[PDB]
Structures are given as C-alpha cells and as structure tokens.
C-alpha cells in the first residue's frame, strides 16, 4: 500500500494509469492512494491533457515492492584462539537474503582483514595475540538493507614463552607432609596433578601442600595453562 | 530448570540478551514457561526475561529470573596440626586459608571458640581430655565442599 506523487500541472488536468494489477483509488489526483501492489515492479503512468488536447504529454514512474525475507542475521558463536593469526569466522547461510561481514574502521586500520566479506563463512587474518576482534554480520533484503545484524568476537590468547619449572626434589625421613614449590608463571595459571595417592591442598598454588605423602617416593606434576591454551608446559617434582 | 507461572489468558516466551546467547547459553523450547537453560558456566550470572503477550497486544508485561552459578572449588580442607597443652587451658588453632569461599570451626565438645570463621581462631577453654575441632569449607550456595579436623 502506498501513494503516488506527481507534480500538479499549471494549466491542465492530470490522470493516472496502471499495470500489473495495481489499483488507484483516485486516478485523477497527483497524490492519490494505491492499494493493490504486486511484488516486484510495476509502472505507473502520468498522462496530462487539457480539454480537447487529449494525451498531450506523458511521464513514467515506478513502484518497487520487496516482501520481507525470512532469514535473520544469525552469526556464529564467539571463539577462543591460542597463537593463531587467522580464523574462520562463521554465520548461517541465508537463502532469502544476502549480507556481508564488516568491522570497525579503527580495527581495519590495524591490519585486520576480512576475506571475501559477502561470503558468510570466510577467514579473518592478521589477528594479534593478547587482543579481541569484533565482526558484524549484516543481513540485507533486496531493497531493505540492514534488515538485521548480529556479531562474532574473536578472543586471541597468548601462547606464552614460559616453561614449567616446578621445584626441587623433596625427601622426607620422618614426616608425612611437604611444601611443594614451583616457579610462578607470569602467563595464565597452572596446577599440581598426581599419579599416586596423596592429598593436595590448594592444587592451584605453586606452594601447595601435600598432607599425606606415601612411604615410597611419589611424583607431583606442575602444569601451566592460559585461557584457551589448555596445556602449554609441564614438568615434575620427586 | 528456569520457571514461571503458566498463564491461561496469554502466551509468552523466555528470551535472553544476544551478548549472552553468543557465549553459548541456550534456552530450550522458549515458548514453554518451564524449560531448562543449558551451557551455564561457573563463576557467572545469567539473566532470562519472561515476556508475556496477548493475542494482538504483545509485550503486555515482562519479568526476569537470574541464575547465579557458583564455583565448586578444587581446594580441600587442611585444618592444622595436632595441638597438645600440658599446663594451659587455651590454644591457637590454624588452618590453610582456602582461596575459594569461606569456612569455619565447629566442635563436638565443650570449649569456647572466639571468632570461628578464622583459620587462626582461639580456643579459650579447652578441656582436660583431648577435644576435636573441625574445619569446614563452603562457598556461597556450595554449603559444604570439604572438611577435615584437628586434635
């Protein structure tokens, strides 16, 4: 449903005609209403005449109708990377709509590049570690753009240089308890694990406490990790 | 399971912010007032909105349920080291201070405990015979995650 818009004549009488089923409520007015409108396009004609000077001058105007699409922006889920400079960033592939991946200019200016933006499932390159990247999926209809939006973030964690050190051989003669030690990593976190039965108090401390060490030697393992970097380094203490 | 009253003159659905949906939090069968939410992580907070609609008058009213998910921690209770008083009716207890939640001392015998929530609490009237103090760790809704004891 819409209205027409023609410029009224100075000294004549106007008239509208239609095509493809469109209906004009008042064909004699430059600003009349139109209620039947097919999808796609149709041409309306403005014919101007005066008295006996019939079909004197004409002009062409078109009305374009695009129905709402059923697809909505549907971006993939955020991800978490470790040491990568590239990733596939995803979205649902729409069928009644098209769209593209975009990013803020301030991030594009740092070298972050979206490959083939109009393809819903392409890679992003130039990602740096210790940072966060945001991509927006914008879906558009034929003539009704920015129909809907959604957004995927890439969190890129640092794959650190630190190695596990754990600590120094412990040796108990008459005691069933010990204080372990380890270098405290400056990246991420870490914890103690074991392959034998002993009770560990606060495994996430480098300085954890073993409260029931066996008679024979046991081994404690110090594992370092950082966010999505589930295991970057291990070593052990006897 | 996240719940709501089941309306009879109206229908509605559970929704969530896009920024939380993007982290993997999923509402099952949103139009059903009493369904589950999955993918919840510990140490976090989730918010769900119940939106009720009339036949042609949507967003008639709204309300909201929060899920607070506490961490079930790795720490064990350690409590402390056997105490032994020869001529003294008082002692300082000790315990590893948990890095998750809190904790406190309890007892099965008569002694007065000053500030039970300290690892380093004070016993001011220990009996003649041995007594036992119990160190219990807890975290928010995690009412009791670990216990051990000191003689």
PDB file of C-alpha atoms in Angstrom, chain B:
ATOM      1  CA  UNK B   1      15.177 -25.501  35.124  1.00  0.00           C
ATOM      2  CA  UNK B   2      14.097 -21.922  34.968  1.00  0.00           C
ATOM      3  CA  UNK B   3      10.493 -21.305  35.908  1.00  0.00           C
ATOM      4  CA  UNK B   4       7.431 -19.080  35.539  1.00  0.00           C
ATOM      5  CA  UNK B   5       3.746 -19.204  36.276  1.00  0.00           C
ATOM      6  CA  UNK B   6       1.828 -20.841  33.465  1.00  0.00           C
ATOM      7  CA  UNK B   7      -0.673 -18.205  32.138  1.00  0.00           C
ATOM      8  CA  UNK B   8      -4.075 -19.177  30.712  1.00  0.00           C
ATOM      9  CA  UNK B   9      -5.305 -15.970  29.031  1.00  0.00           C
ATOM     10  CA  UNK B  10      -1.945 -15.136  27.475  1.00  0.00           C
ATOM     11  CA  UNK B  11       1.117 -16.794  25.944  1.00  0.00           C
ATOM     12  CA  UNK B  12       4.774 -15.913  26.103  1.00  0.00           C
ATOM     13  CA  UNK B  13       8.392 -16.898  25.871  1.00  0.00           C
ATOM     14  CA  UNK B  14      11.775 -16.811  27.560  1.00  0.00           C
ATOM     15  CA  UNK B  15      14.409 -14.618  25.928  1.00  0.00           C
ATOM     16  CA  UNK B  16      17.966 -13.534  26.676  1.00  0.00           C
ATOM     17  CA  UNK B  17      20.399 -10.834  25.635  1.00  0.00           C
ATOM     18  CA  UNK B  18      22.234 -11.508  22.383  1.00  0.00           C
ATOM     19  CA  UNK B  19      25.569 -10.989  24.105  1.00  0.00           C
ATOM     20  CA  UNK B  20      24.874 -13.944  26.374  1.00  0.00           C
ATOM     21  CA  UNK B  21      23.379 -16.097  23.638  1.00  0.00           C
ATOM     22  CA  UNK B  22      26.616 -15.565  21.770  1.00  0.00           C
ATOM     23  CA  UNK B  23      28.527 -17.254  24.569  1.00  0.00           C
ATOM     24  CA  UNK B  24      26.600 -20.469  24.104  1.00  0.00           C
ATOM     25  CA  UNK B  25      23.792 -20.037  26.612  1.00  0.00           C
ATOM     26  CA  UNK B  26      20.737 -21.817  25.246  1.00  0.00           C
ATOM     27  CA  UNK B  27      17.053 -21.599  26.160  1.00  0.00           C
ATOM     28  CA  UNK B  28      15.220 -24.819  25.371  1.00  0.00           C
ATOM     29  CA  UNK B  29      11.753 -24.512  23.860  1.00  0.00           C
ATOM     30  CA  UNK B  30      11.383 -20.774  24.726  1.00  0.00           C
ATOM     31  CA  UNK B  31       7.584 -20.727  24.425  1.00  0.00           C
ATOM     32  CA  UNK B  32       7.226 -23.250  27.219  1.00  0.00           C
ATOM     33  CA  UNK B  33       7.150 -21.373  30.574  1.00  0.00           C
ATOM     34  CA  UNK B  34       9.063 -24.121  32.402  1.00  0.00           C
ATOM     35  CA  UNK B  35      12.084 -25.410  30.490  1.00  0.00           C
ATOM     36  CA  UNK B  36      15.770 -25.696  31.023  1.00  0.00           C
ATOM     37  CA  UNK B  37      18.687 -23.488  30.217  1.00  0.00           C
ATOM     38  CA  UNK B  38      21.969 -25.137  29.305  1.00  0.00           C
ATOM     39  CA  UNK B  39      25.650 -24.289  28.869  1.00  0.00           C
ATOM     40  CA  UNK B  40      25.866 -22.320  32.082  1.00  0.00           C
ATOM     41  CA  UNK B  41      29.378 -21.662  33.328  1.00  0.00           C
ATOM     42  CA  UNK B  42      30.525 -21.467  36.939  1.00  0.00           C
ATOM     43  CA  UNK B  43      31.558 -18.147  38.397  1.00  0.00           C
ATOM     44  CA  UNK B  44      28.997 -16.275  36.366  1.00  0.00           C
ATOM     45  CA  UNK B  45      25.460 -14.833  36.154  1.00  0.00           C
ATOM     46  CA  UNK B  46      22.761 -15.419  33.594  1.00  0.00           C
ATOM     47  CA  UNK B  47      19.621 -13.383  33.014  1.00  0.00           C
ATOM     48  CA  UNK B  48      16.411 -14.546  31.434  1.00  0.00           C
ATOM     49  CA  UNK B  49      13.373 -12.448  30.622  1.00  0.00           C
ATOM     50  CA  UNK B  50       9.826 -13.749  30.558  1.00  0.00           C
ATOM     51  CA  UNK B  51       7.761 -11.783  28.110  1.00  0.00           C
ATOM     52  CA  UNK B  52       4.044 -12.265  28.112  1.00  0.00           C
ATOM     53  CA  UNK B  53       1.871 -11.366  25.120  1.00  0.00           C
ATOM     54  CA  UNK B  54      -1.831 -11.048  24.363  1.00  0.00           C
ATOM     55  CA  UNK B  55      -3.348 -12.130  21.076  1.00  0.00           C
ATOM     56  CA  UNK B  56      -2.614  -8.827  19.311  1.00  0.00           C
ATOM     57  CA  UNK B  57      -1.030  -6.776  22.157  1.00  0.00           C
ATOM     58  CA  UNK B  58       2.449  -8.160  22.578  1.00  0.00           C
ATOM     59  CA  UNK B  59       4.954  -7.330  25.239  1.00  0.00           C
ATOM     60  CA  UNK B  60       1.992  -6.940  27.567  1.00  0.00           C
ATOM     61  CA  UNK B  61       4.220  -7.382  30.550  1.00  0.00           C
ATOM     62  CA  UNK B  62       7.675  -8.622  31.461  1.00  0.00           C
ATOM     63  CA  UNK B  63       9.515 -10.171  34.409  1.00  0.00           C
ATOM     64  CA  UNK B  64      13.046 -11.630  34.970  1.00  0.00           C
ATOM     65  CA  UNK B  65      14.902 -14.656  36.584  1.00  0.00           C
ATOM     66  CA  UNK B  66      18.611 -14.641  37.280  1.00  0.00           C
ATOM     67  CA  UNK B  67      20.780 -17.719  37.620  1.00  0.00           C
ATOM     68  CA  UNK B  68      23.808 -17.313  39.802  1.00  0.00           C
ATOM     69  CA  UNK B  69      26.215 -20.181  39.280  1.00  0.00           C
ATOM     70  CA  UNK B  70      28.821 -20.624  41.984  1.00  0.00           C
ATOM     71  CA  UNK B  71      32.111 -22.439  41.619  1.00  0.00           C
ATOM     72  CA  UNK B  72      32.547 -25.828  43.212  1.00  0.00           C
ATOM     73  CA  UNK B  73      36.214 -25.295  44.070  1.00  0.00           C
ATOM     74  CA  UNK B  74      39.229 -27.651  43.961  1.00  0.00           C
ATOM     75  CA  UNK B  75      40.548 -26.791  47.460  1.00  0.00           C
ATOM     76  CA  UNK B  76      40.443 -29.333  50.227  1.00  0.00           C
ATOM     77  CA  UNK B  77      40.244 -28.570  53.874  1.00  0.00           C
ATOM     78  CA  UNK B  78      43.624 -28.867  55.670  1.00  0.00           C
ATOM     79  CA  UNK B  79      42.784 -27.586  59.088  1.00  0.00           C
ATOM     80  CA  UNK B  80      46.024 -27.661  61.088  1.00  0.00           C
ATOM     81  CA  UNK B  81      48.476 -29.618  63.267  1.00  0.00           C
ATOM     82  CA  UNK B  82      47.802 -31.633  66.428  1.00  0.00           C
ATOM     83  CA  UNK B  83      47.808 -29.299  69.458  1.00  0.00           C
ATOM     84  CA  UNK B  84      48.958 -30.557  72.920  1.00  0.00           C
ATOM     85  CA  UNK B  85      48.705 -28.473  76.081  1.00  0.00           C
ATOM     86  CA  UNK B  86      50.417 -29.532  79.265  1.00  0.00           C
ATOM     87  CA  UNK B  87      49.606 -26.700  81.657  1.00  0.00           C
ATOM     88  CA  UNK B  88      47.488 -24.233  79.685  1.00  0.00           C
ATOM     89  CA  UNK B  89      43.720 -24.009  79.053  1.00  0.00           C
ATOM     90  CA  UNK B  90      43.993 -22.107  75.740  1.00  0.00           C
ATOM     91  CA  UNK B  91      45.206 -22.587  72.201  1.00  0.00           C
ATOM     92  CA  UNK B  92      45.601 -21.003  68.809  1.00  0.00           C
ATOM     93  CA  UNK B  93      44.268 -23.170  66.036  1.00  0.00           C
ATOM     94  CA  UNK B  94      45.460 -22.848  62.492  1.00  0.00           C
ATOM     95  CA  UNK B  95      44.256 -23.962  59.092  1.00  0.00           C
ATOM     96  CA  UNK B  96      45.030 -23.444  55.460  1.00  0.00           C
ATOM     97  CA  UNK B  97      43.067 -20.476  54.293  1.00  0.00           C
ATOM     98  CA  UNK B  98      41.018 -21.601  51.349  1.00  0.00           C
ATOM     99  CA  UNK B  99      41.180 -19.410  48.237  1.00  0.00           C
ATOM    100  CA  UNK B 100      37.542 -20.222  47.490  1.00  0.00           C
ATOM    101  CA  UNK B 101      34.570 -19.108  49.519  1.00  0.00           C
ATOM    102  CA  UNK B 102      34.948 -19.212  53.298  1.00  0.00           C
ATOM    103  CA  UNK B 103      34.827 -21.626  56.223  1.00  0.00           C
ATOM    104  CA  UNK B 104      34.583 -22.052  59.968  1.00  0.00           C
ATOM    105  CA  UNK B 105      35.374 -24.128  63.032  1.00  0.00           C
ATOM    106  CA  UNK B 106      32.814 -26.359  64.705  1.00  0.00           C
ATOM    107  CA  UNK B 107      33.073 -28.748  67.643  1.00  0.00           C
ATOM    108  CA  UNK B 108      31.557 -31.859  69.223  1.00  0.00           C
ATOM    109  CA  UNK B 109      32.652 -30.949  72.745  1.00  0.00           C
ATOM    110  CA  UNK B 110      32.541 -28.018  75.139  1.00  0.00           C
ATOM    111  CA  UNK B 111      35.113 -25.288  74.637  1.00  0.00           C
ATOM    112  CA  UNK B 112      34.613 -21.652  73.787  1.00  0.00           C
ATOM    113  CA  UNK B 113      35.694 -20.571  70.310  1.00  0.00           C
ATOM    114  CA  UNK B 114      36.469 -16.960  69.597  1.00  0.00           C
ATOM    115  CA  UNK B 115      35.807 -15.914  66.007  1.00  0.00           C
ATOM    116  CA  UNK B 116      35.016 -19.365  64.488  1.00  0.00           C
ATOM    117  CA  UNK B 117      35.371 -18.041  60.973  1.00  0.00           C
ATOM    118  CA  UNK B 118      39.102 -17.507  61.285  1.00  0.00           C
ATOM    119  CA  UNK B 119      41.540 -20.198  60.387  1.00  0.00           C
ATOM    120  CA  UNK B 120      43.524 -18.751  63.257  1.00  0.00           C
ATOM    121  CA  UNK B 121      40.736 -18.925  65.803  1.00  0.00           C
ATOM    122  CA  UNK B 122      41.212 -19.029  69.529  1.00  0.00           C
ATOM    123  CA  UNK B 123      40.127 -21.737  71.931  1.00  0.00           C
ATOM    124  CA  UNK B 124      39.795 -20.210  75.367  1.00  0.00           C
ATOM    125  CA  UNK B 125      38.593 -23.120  77.497  1.00  0.00           C
ATOM    126  CA  UNK B 126      39.910 -26.464  76.257  1.00  0.00           C
ATOM    127  CA  UNK B 127      39.031 -29.443  78.481  1.00  0.00           C
ATOM    128  CA  UNK B 128      41.325 -31.810  80.336  1.00  0.00           C
ATOM    129  CA  UNK B 129      40.823 -34.604  77.840  1.00  0.00           C
ATOM    130  CA  UNK B 130      41.553 -34.144  74.151  1.00  0.00           C
ATOM    131  CA  UNK B 131      38.955 -32.335  72.114  1.00  0.00           C
ATOM    132  CA  UNK B 132      38.487 -32.095  68.376  1.00  0.00           C
ATOM    133  CA  UNK B 133      37.908 -29.069  66.199  1.00  0.00           C
ATOM    134  CA  UNK B 134      36.518 -29.403  62.709  1.00  0.00           C
ATOM    135  CA  UNK B 135      37.350 -27.055  59.854  1.00  0.00           C
ATOM    136  CA  UNK B 136      34.603 -26.838  57.235  1.00  0.00           C
ATOM    137  CA  UNK B 137      34.883 -25.067  53.906  1.00  0.00           C
ATOM    138  CA  UNK B 138      31.947 -23.619  51.944  1.00  0.00           C
ATOM    139  CA  UNK B 139      31.273 -21.255  49.010  1.00  0.00           C
ATOM    140  CA  UNK B 140      28.052 -19.315  48.611  1.00  0.00           C
ATOM    141  CA  UNK B 141      25.370 -21.843  47.715  1.00  0.00           C
ATOM    142  CA  UNK B 142      28.063 -24.631  47.998  1.00  0.00           C
ATOM    143  CA  UNK B 143      27.157 -25.222  51.655  1.00  0.00           C
ATOM    144  CA  UNK B 144      29.853 -27.785  52.407  1.00  0.00           C
ATOM    145  CA  UNK B 145      32.542 -28.694  49.938  1.00  0.00           C
ATOM    146  CA  UNK B 146      35.272 -30.016  52.206  1.00  0.00           C
ATOM    147  CA  UNK B 147      36.014 -30.900  55.827  1.00  0.00           C
ATOM    148  CA  UNK B 148      38.934 -32.112  57.926  1.00  0.00           C
ATOM    149  CA  UNK B 149      39.869 -31.928  61.611  1.00  0.00           C
ATOM    150  CA  UNK B 150      42.432 -31.052  64.293  1.00  0.00           C
ATOM    151  CA  UNK B 151      43.120 -32.908  67.628  1.00  0.00           C
TER     152      UNK B 151
END
